[PDB]
Symmetry: D2
Amino acid sequence: DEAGITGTWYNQLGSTFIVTAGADGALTGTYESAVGNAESRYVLTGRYDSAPATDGSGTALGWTVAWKNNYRNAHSATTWSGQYVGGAEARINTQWLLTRGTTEAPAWAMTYVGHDTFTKVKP
Amino acid sequence: DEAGITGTWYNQLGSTFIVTAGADGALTGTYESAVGNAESRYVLTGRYDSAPATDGSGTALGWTVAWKNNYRNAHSATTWSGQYVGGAEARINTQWLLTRGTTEAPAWAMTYVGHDTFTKVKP
Amino acid sequence: DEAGITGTWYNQLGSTFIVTAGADGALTGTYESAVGNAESRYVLTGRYDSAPATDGSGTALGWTVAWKNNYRNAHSATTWSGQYVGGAEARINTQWLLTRGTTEAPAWAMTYVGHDTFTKVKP
Amino acid sequence: DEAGITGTWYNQLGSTFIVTAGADGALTGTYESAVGNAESRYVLTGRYDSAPATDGSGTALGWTVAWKNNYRNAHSATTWSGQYVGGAEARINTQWLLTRGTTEAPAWAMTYVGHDTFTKVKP
Ligand SMILES: NCCNS(=O)(=O)c1ccc(NC(=O)CCCC[C@@H]2SC[C@@H]3NC(=O)N[C@@H]32)cc1
Ligand SMILES: NCCNS(=O)(=O)c1ccc(NC(=O)CCCC[C@@H]2SC[C@@H]3NC(=O)N[C@@H]32)cc1
Ligand SMILES: NCCNS(=O)(=O)c1ccc(NC(=O)CCCC[C@@H]2SC[C@@H]3NC(=O)N[C@@H]32)cc1
Ligand SMILES: NCCNS(=O)(=O)c1ccc(NC(=O)CCCC[C@@H]2SC[C@@H]3NC(=O)N[C@@H]32)cc1
Ligand SMILES: [Ir+4]
Ligand SMILES: [Ir+4]
Ligand SMILES: [Ir+4]
Ligand SMILES: [Ir+4]
Ligand SMILES: [Ir+4]
Ligand SMILES: [Ir+4]
Ligand SMILES: [Ir+4]
Ligand SMILES: [Ir+4]
Ligand SMILES: [Ir+4]
Ligand SMILES: [Ir+4]
Ligand SMILES: [Ir+4]
Ligand SMILES: [Ir+4]
Ligand SMILES: [Ir+4]
Ligand SMILES: [Ir+4]
Ligand SMILES: [Ir+4]
Ligand SMILES: [Ir+4]
């Protein structure tokens, strides 16, 4: 799955996820969001299960982007959790949590939840 | 917040999160879970907003653990998303997503959601 | 949106959601899941915003199914939260939480998160 | 658990949840939020597993509030999913999803996730 994962992925919004999978389980790369308070590339880091159960079973993985680079600071961070499924139409199906840096007035409302599907071809 | 974050944290279950915050926004360290299919330490990586809005506002951050080390492979990965709040009782308040590597029979049921609060003193 | 909502909806898994929207904001109906520990129809109840902001804006809503009927007891319950969007291809886009009745050994792992999209035509 | 559930509950924010559990699995009542865009009581409806596995196991349940009453319309709705645990310190431990009625500019950001713990005594 190392070879499967490494590369460029696109989600349903047009965002671009460029990642390298390490042999040890590391994930490193850059993320560019087509939406929100974001411009250009942001660093990402994460992990994956580098010894999946190959018996028709996806590979677990996750990663994080803090939404600060040289251009913008959106005072927020997103984590995606999901699985890589290989094959002719390879996908990474994820859910995500986006937490914003705020005061303790709306701290109850600090996190969005959503989902992203990544494919090797761009919509 | 770099100095604030770096160190050892404990959640309400007794798990131990040892992290170093980089000046650039990197998070690196190890995680030991007191529960689930887990034993000893696991690598973690993540990111944080290294230029918060200091106006009473938390620092956004997240990180990932893939639940494979030399002892066990739980074919899963967890991402935590939340915020660091500094001060006399410093906390990292998070929500988390745990995705399991499974077939496409229960792929609809691939992810748990939960929440963890981390403190500098252990319960 | 009352007229919009009331009716039969289908999700991407083949499940069937039959609902009536009340003028007061009530939602009542039955749910049949194509997957999981489920057979035949289950009662549902929920609510919707019966005075949306009609300025291109979806209508907020949610509902609950407890997964017990005359045939099966799956000791669980699911809530869906999302929005109705009207028009030629009307949709209800939701996220959901499914909580299982368990002991306090895996209570940290009590809830799944997922997402469903409902359409008026069945896949 | 019918007798257990029916009554007045308080969460960690000071909100008040007044509910009646039906013998058939119905939940009906009113919710008053101490926070957000909310004033006075709002109708709620939901369901619970009215034949739990009494072997130390919680009772699954959920419910919905649409945040419109005679005073305010917050164009949103919240669903809570969780479990009732009985005894000397009875609790309802939940996670929740709050979806807002918005356009398809930030539809990716339509839902918050959080968690509430309800007790029979108010903080
Ligand atoms: N009131 C002030 C602003 N309003 S606010 O609500 O407080 C708020 C604050 C910060 C954000 N932060 C971002 O906008 C960064 C990019 C997020 C891209 C997501 S990351 C998940 C999803 N997938 C993707 O490829 N792009 C999207 C979002 C909303
Ligand atoms: N049917 C086979 C097993 N059953 S299964 O359901 O498929 C399943 C599969 C894998 C897992 N994976 C783990 O158990 C690793 C540690 C998780 C620790 C969490 S991580 C969030 C929480 N916080 C913490 O400090 N510890 C806990 C959990 C459940
Ligand atoms: N170890 C014992 C069983 N394993 S367990 O993990 O503890 C567990 C326990 C109970 C359930 N409960 C159901 O299976 C009922 C139907 C759920 C349908 C969902 S509801 C959201 C989604 N949308 C839909 O239309 N169908 C699906 C699921 C998993
Ligand atoms: N930009 C315009 C407003 N900003 S917005 O972000 O779009 C937005 C829109 C609507 C809401 N809707 C409410 O505020 C109603 C009460 C929610 C109470 C929760 S319900 C879960 C939690 N538990 C509880 O007892 N009270 C709290 C929240 C945020
Ligand atoms: Ir395996
Ligand atoms: Ir918070
Ligand atoms: Ir919280
Ligand atoms: Ir979707
Ligand atoms: Ir700032
Ligand atoms: Ir899946
Ligand atoms: Ir999905
Ligand atoms: Ir809690
Ligand atoms: Ir309006
Ligand atoms: Ir629990
Ligand atoms: Ir909890
Ligand atoms: Ir999807
Ligand atoms: Ir039982
Ligand atoms: Ir949406
Ligand atoms: Ir969506
Ligand atoms: Ir909490």
